[PDB]
């Protein structure tokens, strides 16, 4: 599957920083920062640099417009929760497509957060809203009266998805070409009767990977310490899964990596 998603952040400064980023799968392609001389939407991927100045003027239009509403929204949220004006507060925006088998919308998103907690989110049916508290019910009532969910349907199943398909063709040589993981296993003792088998996976795109340590063929779901898929810095990602095994029993454990870049799931053995 494929996905486009935007991530907005607005932080209130007493006496507001507005950052927005756009992703196609695990590849960033656009950025807007209010803390710039002449703030503009700028390309972070090669396949959006070929878009015309008309596209970027249009993109910068909504960014500067949304930063204005984020100034109004952060101030409205202050009175909603009756908080003082001396503190900093965060308001995030998460919306985007999820592409399906044929090419149509699989899932649509439109989520708002306030201070790390859920605020209001467009339901999956793209007709109803889920308010997280009585303060968000004010925003909900505001949006049902203006038929905001009608606008999101036309975007998510329309402009959203059509442009996700457009990016995946204009950048098909990178967005649709998967890189296989370069895997290896390390072995470190933690006792005189115990060891740690660590299964590595480096330089793979996309970031979707599942590393599993199986003893005797069966999944050791727990006892398998796993870390966040981290970026390598060049567009690829890394990840490792570890398991603490008794010494002399390491020949019983096998690592299993499945990634879109692999022709078949490969079996590792330190």
């Amino acid at each position: 599957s494929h996905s486009m998603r935007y991530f907005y952040t607005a932080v209130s400064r007493p006496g507001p920083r507005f950052i927005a980023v756009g992703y196609v799968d695990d590849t960033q392609f656009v950025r807007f920062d209010s803390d710039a001389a002449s703030p503009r939407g700028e390309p972070r991927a090669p396949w959006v640099e070929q878009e015309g100045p008309e596209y970027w003027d249009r993109e910068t239009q909504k960014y500067k417009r949304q930063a204005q509403a984020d100034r109004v929204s952060l101030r409205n949220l202050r009175g909603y929760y009756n908080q003082s004006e001396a503190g900093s507060h965060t308001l995030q925006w998460m919306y985007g497509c999820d592409l399906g088998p044929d090419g149509r919308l699989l899932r649509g998103y439109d989520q708002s957060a306030y201070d790390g907690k859920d605020y209001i989110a467009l339901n999956e049916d793209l007709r109803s809203w889920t308010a997280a508290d009585t303060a968000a019910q004010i925003t909900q009532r505001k949006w049902e009266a203006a038929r905001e969910a009608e606008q999101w349907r036309a975007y998510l199943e329309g402009t959203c998805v059509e442009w996700l398909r457009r990016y995946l063709e204009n950048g098909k040589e990178t967005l649709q070409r998967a890189e296989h993981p370069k895997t290896h296993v390390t072995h470190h003792p933690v006792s005189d009767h115990e060891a740690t088998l660590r299964c590595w996976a480096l330089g793979f795109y996309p970031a979707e990977i599942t590393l599993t340590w199986q003893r005797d063929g069966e999944d050791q779901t727990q006892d398998t310490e796993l870390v966040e898929t981290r970026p390598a810095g060049d567009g690829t990602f890394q990840k490792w899964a570890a398991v603490v095994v008794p010494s002399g029993e390491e020949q019983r454990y096998t690592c299993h990596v499945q990634h879109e870049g692999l022709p078949e799931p490969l079996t590792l053995r330190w």
């Binding site: 935007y6 927005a20 756009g22 656009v30 993109e59 909504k62 960014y63 417009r65 949304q66 509403a69 984020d70 109004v72 929204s73 409205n76 949220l77 909603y80 308001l91 925006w93 919306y95 439109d110 708002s112 605020y119 209001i120 968000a136 004010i138 925003t139 505001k142 905001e148 606008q151 999101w152 975007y155 402009t159 959203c160 442009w163």
Partner: peptide, 9 residues
């Protein structure tokens, strides 16, 4: 292509 409308609480 970002959302053309506006989010307002």
């Amino acid at each position: 292509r970002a959302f053309p409308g506006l989010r307002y609480v």
